[PDB]
Design a protein around this ligand. Sequence first.
Ligand SMILES: CCCCCCCCCCO
Ligand SMILES: CCCCCCCCCCO
Lengths: 154, 154
Amino acid sequence: IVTQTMKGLDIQKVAGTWYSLAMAASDISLLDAQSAPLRVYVEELKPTPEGDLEILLQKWENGECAQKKIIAEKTKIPAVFKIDALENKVLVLDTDYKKYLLFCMENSLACQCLVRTPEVDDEALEKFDKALKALPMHIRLSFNPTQLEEQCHI
Amino acid sequence: IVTQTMKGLDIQKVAGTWYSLAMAASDISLLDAQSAPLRVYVEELKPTPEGDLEILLQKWENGECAQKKIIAEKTKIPAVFKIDALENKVLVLDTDYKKYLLFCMENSLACQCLVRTPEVDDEALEKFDKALKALPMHIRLSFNPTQLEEQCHI
Ligand SMILES: CCCCCCCCCCO
Ligand SMILES: CCCCCCCCCCO
């Protein structure tokens, strides 16, 4: 579905701290509750030497804000990674490395606007909303700076 | 794919202790390593009053044997349940409640032979192998009684 990838992506430069400022999904039930399957809060990106992408995130599971480690394996396309499951692609749509990164995960579909700091970046949200115009989204969430500094954005 | 369901299933009677004696899958990578996506060890079945099925299992994630709680929501078919994800069906193929329960999960496909006790039940494995003859499986695992009494069947 997603036909926006970052040309010339350098995966090593996305390493470090990120905040899930905004999230959108094709299906309300993917994001509606704290325990919703794609309500995931990114903490850190850890690209490996071989160019895989380790993801540290937080996810509400069985009443607690749990820490999870995901590995997204590189493909022939620098901006596309695969997670192992009962087959889920991560696409990097756009990043400036310093401030924002837009990504989508698709099997049904969820996208996030990541930012380096706990601040509302109007420029990153404009770019996120433009990228979503092309996509069939039915739920969109954004978080305030107080929530961004809390586990699972409470 | 799976066209074997238990007629007349009483979900309340599957409550309590189970052991993942054998596992099979359509794809080697679904079961090959300890961290493989469908290498899940059932601990307990907890049907709810409303006829949902809570599952307690163990799964190897990031170097540890972790405890997980899954909820499989009932459908119009008593032997079929749905898990919420980026859409996975659990089918109960066959059970005698007292000794064995055969189930499959499908989106790609994994089936298990569950038994009430840490013993190799030749009758339950015969029934499991018969149920699999109809299915496109490419990996099959079974565990010994020592492994069945260990976390993640170490
Ligand atoms: C830009 C890289 C961030 C990807 C996060 C993918 C989260 C995986 C979803 C687990 O259900
Ligand atoms: C017979 C009921 C046992 C169903 C177990 C389903 C396990 C869910 C798989 C999570 O990845």
